[PDB]
């Protein structure tokens, strides 16, 4: 069922980069593992996943426009996802200006 | 099948008791029987002495 209704997606696990500053506790601006974000990632794992309710919620503010929205997904069996894991769907393209 | 607010339902002519094309076949039989019975009258019955 899951393999049928799902979409092919790359699953890459998340882990804190060693480059974090030991004293402030905040990351280096640029390093190979993580590009300023304080969280690095492992090699991707090809996976099929179902996705629903995908929303491109736009907030217009003094800082500018911002894209943020909720999308609800459902995995396969035996897979234990973790907080701030990352997914990317090559098939689906999104317009931006 | 229902996914993400879009739903579809289909009911085929297939059934446990009859196949999907059974209606066409059964109408073909109805025509063939008429067609064949009428044509036999063009040739007629067979007879042999004994």
């Amino acid at each position: 069922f899951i393999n049928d209704r799902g979409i092919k997606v790359l699953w890459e696990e998340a882990y804190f980069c060693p480059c974090l500053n030991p004293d402030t506790g905040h990351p280096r601006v640029d390093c190979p593992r993580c590009h300023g974000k304080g969280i690095a990632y492992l090699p991707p794992k090809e996976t099929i996943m179902a996705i629903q309710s995908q929303e491109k919620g736009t907030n217009q503010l003094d800082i500018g426009i911002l894209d943020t929205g909720t999308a609800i997904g459902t995995t396969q069996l035996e897979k234990r996802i973790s907080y701030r894991d990352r997914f990317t769907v090559p098939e689906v393209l999104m317009p931006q200006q | 099948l229902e996914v993400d607010g879009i739903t579809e339902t289909i009911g085929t002519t297939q059934s446990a008791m009859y196949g999907g094309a059974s209606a066409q076949i059964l109408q073909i039989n109805e025509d063939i029987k008429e067609l064949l019975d009428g044509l036999r009258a063009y040739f007629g019955y067979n007879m042999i002495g004994l």
């Binding site: 190979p32 593992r33 492992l42 090699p43 | -």
Partner: protein
């Protein structure tokens, strides 16, 4: 000849070298080059690195686990990392579609069979089905 390439043919030799622990370089198609390695210690498993440059005081390679496929090894070309040459300064790479003219002034296509040079740096090329050597100008790089 030129000593800039020494590809491995048998996968068995590749596995033998991996058992010895020597690093390998594995090419890709329209994609970055890869280094592959066998992890040390109690548990044995393959590791990969997206970095290519030699280790130094100012540059260290990064290794992570990956489920490397034997298909990649058997299909793609493989070299020893230490003995690999970055580039041979020739117009045409090896195994590249090229066009030429035969002895009877007939045009024909082919791929490069060998890359050669003289002591003065002049480069000669041999094509498939052609024993004679061809000048760099006489060849033509076919567009994909």
């Amino acid at each position: 000849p030129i000593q800039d390439a020494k590809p491995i043919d048998d996968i068995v030799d590749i596995m033998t070298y991996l058992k010895n622990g020597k690093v390998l370089r594995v090419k890709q198609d329209n994609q970055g080059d890869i280094l592959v390695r066998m992890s040390p210690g109690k548990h044995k498993f393959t590791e990969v690195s997206r970095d290519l440059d030699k280790e130094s005081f100012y540059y260290k390679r990064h290794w992570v686990l990956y489920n490397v496929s034997v298909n990649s090894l058997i299909t793609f070309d493989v070299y020893l990392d230490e003995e690999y040459s970055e580039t041979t300064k020739v117009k045409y790479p090896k195994d590249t579609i090229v066009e030429y003219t035969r002895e009877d002034q007939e045009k024909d296509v082919a791929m490069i069979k060998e890359i050669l040079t003289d002591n003065n740096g002049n480069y000669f090329y041999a094509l498939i089905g052609e024993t004679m050597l061809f000048d760099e100008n006489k060849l033509n790089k076919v567009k994909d």
